[PDB]
Every structure is written in C-alpha cells, then in structure tokens.
Design a binder for this molecule. Sequence first.
Ligand code: CLA
Ligand code: CLA
Ligand code: CLA
Ligand code: CLA
Ligand code: CLA
Ligand SMILES: CC1=C(C/C=C(\C)CCC[C@H](C)CCC[C@H](C)CCCC(C)C)C(=O)c2ccccc2C1=O
Lengths: 94, 80, 143, 741, 165, 157
Amino acid sequence: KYGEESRYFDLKDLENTVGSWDMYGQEDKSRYNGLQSEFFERAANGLSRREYILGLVAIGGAGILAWGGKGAADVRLPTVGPQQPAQVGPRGRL
Amino acid sequence: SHTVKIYDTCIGCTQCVRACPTDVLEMVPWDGCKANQIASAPRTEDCVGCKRCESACPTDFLSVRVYLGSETTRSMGLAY
Amino acid sequence: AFTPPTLQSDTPSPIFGGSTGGLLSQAQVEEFHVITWESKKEQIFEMPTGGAAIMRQGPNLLKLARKEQCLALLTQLRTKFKIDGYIYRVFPNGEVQYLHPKDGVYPEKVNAGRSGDNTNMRRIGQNKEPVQIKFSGKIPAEF
Amino acid sequence: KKVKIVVDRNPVATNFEKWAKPGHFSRTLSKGPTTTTWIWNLHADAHDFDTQTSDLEEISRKVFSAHFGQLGIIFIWLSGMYFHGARFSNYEAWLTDPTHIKPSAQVVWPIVGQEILNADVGGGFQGLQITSGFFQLWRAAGITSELQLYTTAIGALVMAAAMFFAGWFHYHKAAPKLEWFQNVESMLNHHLGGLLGLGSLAWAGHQIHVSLPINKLLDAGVDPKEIPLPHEFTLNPELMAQLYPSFSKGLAPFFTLDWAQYSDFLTFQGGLNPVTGGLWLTDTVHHHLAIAVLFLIAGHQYRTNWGIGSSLKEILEAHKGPFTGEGHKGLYEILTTSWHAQLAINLALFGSLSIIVAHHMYAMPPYPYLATDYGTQLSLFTHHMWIGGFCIVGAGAHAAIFMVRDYDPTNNYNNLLDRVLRHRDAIISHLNWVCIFLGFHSFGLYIHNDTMSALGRPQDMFSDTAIQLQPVFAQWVQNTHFLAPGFTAPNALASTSPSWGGDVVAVGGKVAMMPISLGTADFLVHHIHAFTIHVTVLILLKGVLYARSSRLIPDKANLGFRFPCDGPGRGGTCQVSAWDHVFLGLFWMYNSISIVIFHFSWKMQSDVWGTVSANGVSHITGGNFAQSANTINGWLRDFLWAQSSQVIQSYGSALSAYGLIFLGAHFVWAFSLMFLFSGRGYWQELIESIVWAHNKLKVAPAIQPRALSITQGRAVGVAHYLLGGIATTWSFFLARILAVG
Amino acid sequence: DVAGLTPCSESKAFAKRKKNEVKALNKRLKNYEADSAPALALKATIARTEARFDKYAKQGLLCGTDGLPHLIADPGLALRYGHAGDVFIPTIGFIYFAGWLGYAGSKYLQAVAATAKPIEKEIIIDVPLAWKLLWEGFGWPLRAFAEYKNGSLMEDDAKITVSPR
Amino acid sequence: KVQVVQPVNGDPFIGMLETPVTSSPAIAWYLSNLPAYRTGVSPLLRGVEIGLAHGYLLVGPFIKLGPLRDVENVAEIVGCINGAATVLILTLCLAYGAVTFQGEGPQVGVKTLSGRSIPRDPLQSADGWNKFTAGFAVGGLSGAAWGYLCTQILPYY
Ligand code: CLA
Ligand code: CLA
Ligand code: CLA
Ligand code: CLA
Ligand code: CLA
Ligand SMILES: CC1=C(C/C=C(\C)CCC[C@H](C)CCC[C@H](C)CCCC(C)C)C(=O)c2ccccc2C1=O
C-alpha cells in the first residue's frame, strides 16, 4: 500500500494495493483440545479421498432406494396402503 | 474479441473514434478520402460491442462495422 | 519516436469517502486499470463508481475495475475540466501496460506512424457470400 | 433576502403565430417533420421544459401557468359533475329514499339501442348508476336542492375562467421572477395557514352553519323540501338554538374560553351515526376546527420578512450526525433550484396520501349513506389506490430525472445524497434479498397450500384449521383500538371504526361496518402485499441510484434519463436507463395494486358487506375468504370465477356496457403484448415493404413513416397493459358490485 | 330458401324473438306511471323494436334454425334470389366510398409533393385544396381507370427502392 | 466530529466500507473466532465442527414440520432425512472441491488488515478441501444423531 498519506498504489507492494485481505481470517495454532482431535481424524481417516467420499454418497443413494424397497411402508404412507371402493364416473364407465 | 472493420466509404470525420468508450478506434493517414484520414481498429480486444461508433457514422451505409463474436471478460464489460 | 510515461506508483489519490462500486475480486486474479492526471487546483469531480471525489493539487492517482470507467473519468476531465490524463493496464503479477494515449496524441487526431489494421479496402456490400465460406470458422468480413 | 412580489411586465406576447408552427418550443423539433418520429417527439417533449429553455425563471413561469391551466381543467370537471347532478340526476328523489334508490347522474341518448344502459335506478328516473359518491358528499354538505347544484356548477365554470385568465396573465402580463418562486419559507407559511388551515376553518364554518342543521333534520326524518334553506339557518341563531341549544349564548363562551358549552355541536364520540352509517358530522366539525388551528399554528414556523421564524436551510444544515457526515448540506439548494426533486417528493407523499385516503374511507365512512352503497365504496377505494400507486411510480421517475439532470456533485459532497450514492450496491443487494425472501415466504406458502390441497393433505397446508399463521401483532393492535375508549381514550364514547371490534353497524338492512377478523389468509395476503411493494421499491430505487452511473455503464448520465440502451455489447445493455426502470416499476405497481384491491373486494364481500336478518349477518359471498384465500385455486375459482358471472351475463341489461368494456380491456391488454414482446427492427422492415407498396402507386407520404422508437414501443406497451388490466378490473368490480350487494 | 334457410317473414322463431323482446320491454314498462318520461322512452324503444322486426320481415331476410337474419355473400346466389342488398350492394357502396377517400388522399399527396415544402403541407393541411380534392374524388373510379390505362397510376420498378436482396 | 464510516484499510477504492457492524471489535472478534476463519488448525477438525453444528441444526425443521410430524416416531424419520441431507450437502462439497481445486493458482497472495503477510489458507486446496469434506461427513451425521438423542434425554424437549 504505502498508505502513509494518500498513496494507495505501489508496484513493489502490489499485494496490499489490489485489495487482497483476510478480512477476518487469523492464524492461530490453538483451538481444539487434546485426544478429541485424534478421535475425529481417526473417524474421518481414509474417507478423505474423493473416491471413498463418493462411495459414501453411493451408500446414501442405496439408503434412498432402501427406503422405497422397505421403508416407505414402515411409515405407512398412502402410496402403498390399501384402497376403499371406487367411483364410477360421469356416464356408465369405470 | 469483437470483429471491428473499417471500409473505404469512410470520410475521416473522426466521429466513430470520439464515440468509442474503450479506445478501440484511431485515425491513421490515408489517401482515399478528402480528409486524408481513415479509421482503424488496432485494439479490438478492448471492444465491448456497444456499437456507439455505428451510431456516430454519417456515411450511408456506415463504414465502421462491428461484428459481435467471441466473448471475454472485457467484451462482456464485467467488473467482477 | 514516442516513449510511454512510467506509472509513478507513489502518486497521491483524490480525496474520497469510500464506495461500494470500487475494486472487487476481478482485480486480484485478472486485472485492474488505473488513471493518472494532473489537476491545477483542488476541485470536486464525479467518480465512475458513484459519488463525488475531490482531486488534489498536482498529480492524482485513481485505480478502477475496467478500462471503460477510466475512459469515462478521462473524458469528463477533458470536457468539464480541460485536463488530460494517462491510463495504464496493471496485471497482478506486476507488469504494467500503457493504454489509451498510446502514441502521445489522442486517437481522434492523426499521428502519421500508426497501424492501420482492420481497414478493409472494399465496401460493405463487397464481402463474400456465406455459402462461399461455408465450414470455415470465419465471418465473411474478415477475409 | 426580503420576501416580496417581483414580476416582469409583458414578457410574452399574446397571439397565434406559434400555434401555426408545432415544435417551436424545442430546437431539435425545428426544420419540419422529416419522419413520423418528429410527430411522436413533438408530444413526447411538450411538457419537458428543461429541454425547451435553460433558464430556471422561464421553466418556473411555465410550471406556474401549467398549474393554472390544470386547475381550470379540474374546475371545468367539477362544474360538469355539478351540472350533471343538477340536470341529469335523480338527486332529490335519492334524498327522500337514500336506502333503496340507486344514485345516477348520467343519462344516454337513444341512438343505437344504447338506451338499455339507462338503468331502473328508482325515483322515476332512468340513467347510468354512478359510483363516484357525489350524492353522499352533497348530502353531507347539506344541499337538498337542484338549484344549488346548478349554482355551484356555474360558480365552478366562473372559477375555471378565472384559473385560465390567471394562467394567461401570469405568463403574458405579469410573470413572476425566479426569486419569487424560491421563497419556500413564504410558500410554506401560506400553504400551511392560508390554504390548508383557512380552508379547514372555512369548511368547519360551513359545516356548522349549513351541514349540521340540514343533516340533523334529515337524520331525524324530514322531506328535504320543507327543510329551511342554509342561509336562514345561518341568518339567525334562533333555529340553531332549537337544533343545537349552545347557539342561544352565541360567541360569548368562545371568547371567554368556556368552550365546553359548545359540546353539543363540537363533539367527540367516534364510531358511526346509526341512522346513516357515516361519521358524526359534529365530530367532523370538531376535527376540522382542531386541524385548522393546528395548521394555522404550523403556518408561523418559517422566517419571512421579520426576524421571527426559523429558516429551512438552517434547520437542514444542523441535522448532521456521526453516521452521515455533513448530513442535509445541499438539500436546500437542490430543492429550491430543481423542480424534478420537488416533484418526486410531492408525488411520493401525494400517492401515499391517496392510499391513506382509500384506507381511512373504507374503514369508517365520512358521508351519510356511503357505507350502504357498496358500489361507490369499492370504486372509491380502488380509484384512490390506483391514483396513489401511479403517483408513487411518478415519484420514482422524477427522482431518477433529478439524479440524471439536476444533480451536481460539486454542491453534494459527503451529504446524504452522496452517502446514499456511495453505497448503492449494499442497499440494492439487500432490497433484492428482502424481495426474494418475501417472494418465497409469501408465494411459496400459497404454492405449498395448492400442492397439499391437490395431494389430498388439508392437514399439511397453512390454514386456520391446520398449520396456523396468525397475525398476532395486528390482532392485538385491533384489541388495543377496541379497548381504547374509556381507557386510553377517556373522552371517546366509541372506537374510531367498527373494524377493530364491537357490534355490527347496520343501516337500512345492510351492514355499514362490522369487525374484521384476521386469520391465516390475511397473513398470507399481507405478506404478498409487502413482497410486491418491496419489489416495486427495488426497481424504482435501483433506477434512481444507478441513473447516474454503473459498473456496467459508467457514463449513463451522459446518455440521459430516457434512452433505449447502449448497444448489444457487454452481453447486452437493453433497458439500462432509469426510464426503463420506471417502465418495469409500472407493471410491478400494477401487480401490487391489483392484488391489494382483489384482497379488499374479496375480504369485504366475504366478511363485511352483507344484509342483516335480526339473527345474524348474511355476507355477499358467505365467509369463503377464510377457507379459500390461502390457495391460488381459491382465488381463481371462488373469487375470480365466482364473482365474474355478474359481468359475463350482463348482456341485455344496464350492465352490458361493463360487459363490453370487460372484453375490450382484455383486447387492449393483449394488444400491449405486441409492443412489449416485439422489437423495432422487424416493424421497420415491414414498414419498408409497405413503403414499397406505396411507392408502386405514388402514394408515399413526404413525412417518412418510421417504426416506433424503442422507448416509444415500451411506453405504448406499458400504457396499453396498464389501461387494459385496470379497465378489466374496473368493469369486473363495477358490474359485480352493481348486480349484487 | 337459398341454403336451408327460411324467410324471417314466415319463420316462427323470428316472431318468438320479437315477442320476447316486446314482453321484456313491457315488463320494464310495468313499473312507472303512464305519462312519465321513462314511460315515453320505453314506448319509443318498443316502437323502434317492432318497426325493426317488421322491416326485417318485410325486406326478405333469411332466418336460420332460430330467428336471426342471415346474409348471403355470393353474387348470383344473391342476385337471382333477391338478396343483393345483403352483401353485393354494400360491397359496391364501400368500394365507391373508400375509393373516394383514398383517391382524395392520393391526389393531395401528389399535389403537395410538387410544392416548396411538402413536409409542411402534411401536418399543415391546405384546407381549400383538400376540400377541392375531396370533391373531385367522387369521380374516383373513372379517373383511376383512365390513369391506369394511361399508365400514370403505377410507378416503374426501376425508380422504386428495394433492399439488396 | 466522531467518525464511524471509513474506507477499509485507508483506500477509498475498495468495495467495503468500515462500518460499526462489519468491523466492530465484538463482531470482528466473533467472526475471526468462528472455525471457518481458523487457517492455523487442520481443516478436518474444522469441517467436523461445521458438520456437527449443521447436522444438529437441520433436525428441528423436519421434526416440527415434516409430513410425519404428528406421529411418535418423528425423531427417527427426521434423523434419516438429515442423514440424506448431510449426504447431499456432502456431495455438493465433493463437486465444488473437485471443480474449483483441479489445478493451482499462486497469484498475489494475502495479507492482514494491518500489513503482515499471512499464508493463503490450507483449506483452499485440493487436499485441504478433501479434509473439510471428510470432516463434514462425520460431523454432519453425528449432529443429526445427537439431535435424535436430544429428543429423549432433554426434560423440556
Ligand atoms: C387564447 C389565449 C392565448 C394565446 C393566443 C396564447 C398564445 C401563446 N402561448 Mg399561452 N396561455 C394561455 C393563453 C394563450 N396563449 C393560457 C390561458 C394559459 C394558462 C394555461 C397559457 C399558458 C402558456 C404557457 C406556459 C406558455 C404559453 C405559450 C404561448 C405561445 C406559444 C405556445 C402555443 O400557444 O402553442 C399552442 C398551444 C395550444 C394549441 C394549446 C395547448 C394545449 C392545451 C393547453 C391543452 C389543454 C387541455 C385540453 C382540454 C386537452 C386535455 C385532453 C383532452 C384531449 C381531453 C403563444 C404565442 C408558451 C410560450 O410562450 O413559449 C415560450 C408557454 O410556454 N402559454
Ligand atoms: C394564503 C395565500 C395562498 C393561498 C390560499 C394559495 C393557494 C394555492 N397556491 Mg400559492 N403561493 C402563495 C400563497 C397562497 N397560495 C405565495 C405567498 C406564494 C409565493 C411563495 C405562492 C406560490 C405558489 C406556487 C408556485 C404555486 C402555488 C400553487 C397554489 C394552489 C395549490 C394547488 C391546488 O390545486 O390547491 C387547491 C385549489 C384550490 C384551493 C382552488 C382555489 C383557488 C383560489 C383562486 C385560491 C386563491 C388564493 C390566492 C393566493 C388569492 C390571491 C390571488 C388573487 C389576485 C385572485 C393553491 C390554490 C400552485 C398552483 O397550482 O398554481 C396555481 C403553484 O404552482 N402557490
Ligand atoms: C404531478 C404529476 C406529473 C408531472 C407534472 C409530470 C411531468 C413530467 N413528466 Mg412524469 N410521471 C408522472 C407524473 C408527472 N409527471 C407519473 C404519475 C408517472 C408514472 C406513470 C410519470 C412517469 C413519467 C415518465 C416515464 C416520464 C415522465 C416525463 C415527464 C416530463 C415530460 C412529460 C412529457 O411532456 O411527456 C409527454 C406526455 C404525454 C405524451 C401525455 C400522454 C401520456 C399518456 C399516453 C397519457 C395516458 C392516457 C390517458 C390515461 C388517457 C387514456 C384514455 C384513452 C383511451 C384516450 C415532465 C416534466 C418524461 C421525462 O423525460 O421526464 C423529463 C418521462 O419519460 N413522467
Ligand atoms: C390482442 C392482441 C393482438 C392484436 C389485436 C394484434 C393485432 C395485429 N397484429 Mg400482432 N402480435 C401479438 C398480439 C396482437 N396483435 C403478440 C403478442 C405478438 C408477439 C409479439 C404479435 C406479433 C405480431 C407480428 C410480428 C405482426 C403482428 C401483426 C398484427 C396486425 C395484423 C393485421 C390485422 O390483422 O389487422 C387488424 C387490426 C387490428 C386488430 C387493430 C384493431 C382495430 C382498431 C382498434 C381500430 C381503431 C379504432 C379506434 C380508433 C382505436 C383507437 C382508440 C383511441 C384513439 C382512443 C394487427 C394490427 C402483423 C402486421 O403488422 O401486419 C401487417 C405483424 O407482422 N403481430
Ligand atoms: C389516403 C392515404 C392512403 C392511401 C391512398 C393508402 C393506400 C394503400 N395502403 Mg395505406 N396507410 C395510410 C394511408 C393511405 N394508404 C395511413 C395514414 C397509414 C397509417 C395508419 C397506412 C398504413 C397502411 C398499412 C400498414 C398498409 C397499407 C396498405 C395500403 C394499400 C392497400 C389498400 C388499403 O387500403 O390498405 C389499408 C389502408 C389503411 C389501413 C390505412 C387507411 C387510413 C386512412 C383511412 C387513410 C388516410 C386518409 C387521408 C388522411 C385522407 C386525406 C384526404 C385529403 C383530401 C387531405 C393501398 C395502396 C397495405 C399494403 O401495403 O398493401 C399492399 C398495408 O399493409 N396502409
Ligand atoms: C406494432 C409495433 C410497431 C408499429 C407501430 C406503428 C407503426 C404505430 C402505428 C400508429 C398508426 C400510424 C396510427 C394509428 C391511429 C389509431 C387509429 C389510433 C392510435 C391512438 C392515438 C390517438 C394515440 C412498432 O413500431 C414497434 C416498435 C417497437 C416495439 C414494438 C413495436 C410494435 O409492436
């Protein structure tokens, strides 16, 4: 910047003059306590790869289809329940 | 990336150059008209396509023809 | 011959209160333009991004998102103030490219020593028919 | 310095030489109409005085004389209404029986079978049933005579002649100078006190000496023929003391400040007169006197030729805070030197005033027998709503015009205008987000209700019987108003309106006003109103804020307020001008006001208007709003299809004109779609082919026929669209409310 | 009977429609006194309706399934069956009057085209010239046929602008 | 006399303005203290915390408003719905990180509001966003699971 007065451009310091700032991001190592960080990185260990996090979505879609197979009827839902008589129509039809 | 062309019906009135808001057109020396100047488009990469030059051309039919083509971040006139 | 003026980075900026129409994310990773002009007095002009700014005595430095904003500011300086200026293209890697008054004099005045490209020696109606240039990746007017 | 009358003696000669040459006012219209675009631009720039002269003095004089001409036109209109009430009306017959006789003040000539439009209104009279409410207003003023309406018509014709003479005199003989128009202190001091305050005081005097005794006799029940004339009620305090006993002591308790003895005719009850269903005229007298005193007090705030008073500039420039920089610095100069800014402010507050008028006049009728005539009530509300919305859009337009033309950045540095212009992106983005949030949480609620009704799940839709959305704040505000008398309004004997709560006011077997209950459907439609208002504000504010400049187009102020585009470049810059923002805001105001008046008509046909049968109230539609106005199919079917049967089966009756206009306005609305969807190049090329056809037969006009300009096409399209939609709604409303009620 | 249609003089539904209209107007009558202005207006409306129905039955119009007059727009089919006044005679009348107006406008265009300022004469109309040409346009068919036979009515294609294809 | 609206970092040519809400010390501290602006700690734990917060967030609308809101077993069906929502938001993160982090772009950099250089955040990388997506995986399903368990152990529900 070199904004000691009204100079907001500088080719030797072109980083600050363009407007690239952190706004709120600050660097700090301290945040999460012990043991729990290891617990969570072990919980999300091999899943970090793109193929296995895709496979998680694959088993999620498998659950989506498992709802339709056996799961829609377990919460009743009218689309798989029974039916009660019928209606004829305007004229002699069915 | 707009195709801007100048044709020999240009009378060198410099109105297309004055109408340009991104400085695409300029006058180069010429011998085909009374004013001894013709328009040229060396900076068509800065052309947005506003066709203000066509609105300023008094020749019938106009001599500064703009053909809208490939779109870039400058042809689309984006500030973001 | 003509030489382009250098972009003096430590140039004062006009007095301004801060706008929302200024630079954005395009400046950091593509390009932002800048305009430099000499003012003979402290007076108020209009920003291309909205609002009023006071340019100061001597050199004034203003960076803008697009070249069209720089030319709008330059043409309003030339009409309402009779003040010339220089516009530069500044890449984020550091390279600065000179822009509008490229050969010293304004493009509406001849200079004898320019490139007369994109100037066809035919009429509008003397272009080729599109069937004669079929399957070429070009419009009829750039043959 | 020193407010005084300054004029110029004989500036403009009076003759007909410029009448011979059209387009004289502007230089760009000179040298004849080479094209028909000249013809269109001649009407387009007739009132654009900024493009005619650069002098503010001549512009101000033109504006003053145009105001005089408009006042003359309004006086001609008033004279015509009073003349039609005198000659071609059943006003005396209606006075005897206002409950059953339908008002009528226009008859038609039997020429082509159009005498069927002369309705059987009653009183041995045939004519068109009017919905303007002049009969109720005249009864409130205490006319009760045909000769007095004719005398008022003649007086209004004389006043129209006076207005036109004043305009000619102030443009041609004594035209005021620029500094005369800039005496805003004196203008406010005279408009507050001498116009509004003195007018309110004079109307209070008329109401005391004319309206109160005659309407008192009418309410007690007396044929208007034997009622004493207004002057003899005004002439002596004897008859007044018989009707209002406080007139026996005259003006003595007024000057001794024992004003409580005037409580028989200066009252404060609230509610409605049960005989007529209108407000108590003594309450209106007390209101007019109080506001007249308040306005005459307000008329001494500003400093003129004497040291007392405060200057507007001083009050403005001292209202500066830390959040806003210089504050109101420059507002005095941009309002005493720019007519468009004042026009924007006045149009905004004028349209808001018209909307407030519509609200306060349905909520609690001020004229006798106005509530019972549902036709004039619905018509008056809808008319004032549309006038208010139009004036608001014009306010946005003229704010944009001021931003383009009369905005100087030199004298507007770091002030409120500058502060707003320097963060316009934040305001516009946030209004955009509010509009999207309101659109979702209003329209998507209706769509969810549609989907659940169509899925056979009425328990899952938002309704009073399922998932409730109750307007608890509005209901509690109604409760606060209903409980106001005797508590927070100790001197009020009744609430301001029956809409808050209480008993049903019935006049002549019809409900004057009854309490309005708010449920889920009212919640949904109020949020719809908020959404539509917010989007119209978004378009108008965006046009005003980006009229000067933009990220896409940095020099939009150079191109002007009214330009079509800046070419197909930058992806396309169609409709970037502030004019096109007004053009879109016109449609959005149309949508907003249409939904508002639809909600009004359905809500009061379903829950307010109706007949009494000494065991309940039988509404017009039967309470169907609470269970059908939360569903778009309910609006389409139970309101827009059920109530449309009156206008489509109106052929062969007096409402056949409404039936015909109902289709003609559909035609005009769809005719707008030509201009709105198409573009100029097609019509220009088609006109070229037609010009070839004319050239073949030597019938080519010298004035070259051109297609309408892009702004011309947009203006024609929006004008036809709004005309067709508003006239369709007008014919529907009037036919429905005059066939059933 | 030109197309399965019956004359309205003998068609029953025409008389039924006339009776229904007169009965509706009488129902409107039966609310006022005999000599009131609405009574006179309704009596005039009734007289106009009966006169219109009797005239339609007199002129020989054709009624369809119900009592509504139908018009014939075929020469010959209307000439030999006596219904040329349905379409043919008004066709001739419109052609004459529209040709009168169009020829008057055309002659005004060619009269003011050869003046000093033809631009001004089309917004500022020379009223005596317009009146004279409106009078002269009553002989439009003979004048138009004479100018067509002379060849001065149409313009050569080589003197008319076209687009470049 | 008191100034509260200022240009950000001095130059009046950037799109922000200093405002007592976008840079008040309490709100600035709160925004800097959110996990998403912790460039120092590993992105996986940050994604874990974000997923926990969002998974425990999404339980409520489905509980009180879903199609089966009026039956006793609403909690389990809402846990299933939130698992599906976590999966679809997870594949949204997958697609985003796969399309925006397919290469590299080391331009300009980033500095703080005072004038100190700072690294350009390990989250904005192909491997860094993979850890964030994996963190949102275990966190998102756990927040839904804890939301289900909160329906039976809370006294006031
Ligand atoms: C018969 C008296 C008379 C005469 C001979 C003139 C003559 C003149 N006037 Mg003037 N004027 C008059 C009366 C008169 N005026 C009155 C009574 C007023 C008050 C309203 C004005 C206010 C006035 C102003 C403010 C101006 C003039 C101007 C002019 C000069 C040129 C403009 C012009 O007239 O074009 C022709 C005008 C017309 C043919 C009529 C205009 C349209 C009328 C007003 C419409 C009224 C509404 C009407 C009912 C239509 C409504 C809609 C309808 C379809 C239902 C001209 C020499 C202008 C000038 O001096 O130029 C600098 C100027 O700006 N006049
Ligand atoms: C007590 C003094 C007084 C009164 C009653 C008025 C009243 C009015 N003024 Mg005015 N004005 C005044 C003082 C006054 N003014 C002063 C001191 C100035 C100089 C600063 C102005 C400057 C001014 C301007 C620039 C304009 C007005 C306008 C108007 C009209 C408002 C529009 C309207 O339709 O209202 C309601 C309509 C009526 C109430 C109809 C009644 C009309 C009668 C004739 C009012 C008579 C009052 C008049 C001042 C008496 C002196 C004139 C006399 C020689 C006949 C209105 C009639 C506007 C206008 O429309 O122009 C005509 C407008 O353009 N005034
Ligand atoms: C106090 C009210 C008021 C006043 C004094 C003005 C004054 C002005 N306006 Mg404005 N405006 C207003 C209200 C007002 N407006 C409202 C309420 C709207 C919203 C609709 C607008 C929207 C608006 C726009 C978009 C524009 C203006 C413009 C202008 C300026 C030029 C007007 C002109 O000559 O164009 C010509 C005027 C006419 C040709 C009159 C005809 C207009 C339509 C066709 C009439 C509507 C038809 C009518 C209802 C009859 C229908 C029945 C039919 C079947 C016979 C002028 C100074 C123009 C400008 O450039 O500003 C500088 C501009 O473009 N106004
Ligand atoms: C109800 C809607 C509507 C209507 C009435 C029309 C009507 C018309 N279109 Mg159109 N069109 C529409 C919608 C509509 N369009 C839409 C939505 C589109 C898509 C954008 C198009 C696109 C389109 C194209 C591309 C073209 C047309 C063309 C035409 C014209 C065809 C010629 C004709 O049939 O003569 C019939 C005449 C009429 C229907 C006009 C009504 C008669 C008037 C009312 C009589 C005047 C009486 C009175 C004086 C009215 C003024 C009142 C005022 C003074 C108060 C015609 C005027 C073609 C054309 O131009 O033809 C050469 C053409 O090329 N249209
Ligand atoms: C008297 C002038 C005049 C004349 C002789 C003609 C003649 C013609 N026109 Mg044209 N036209 C006119 C005026 C005129 N037009 C005007 C003012 C307009 C703008 C509304 C048009 C718009 C128009 C269109 C869009 C088309 C034609 C077409 C045609 C041709 C088809 C026949 C027809 O009647 O179409 C219909 C004509 C009209 C619908 C317009 C009639 C308007 C009035 C009645 C005429 C003007 C009267 C004039 C003022 C009288 C002056 C009297 C004089 C003593 C001062 C024909 C040769 C069509 C064509 O090209 O055919 C191949 C066609 O597409 N006209
Ligand atoms: C139809 C149409 C035209 C053609 C319109 C024309 C040529 C105007 C036709 C007006 C004629 C000449 C006058 C007709 C007069 C009528 C009898 C009454 C008109 C109402 C006036 C009194 C105002 C355009 O030029 C256009 C331009 C841009 C967008 C859309 C369109 C568009 O839709």
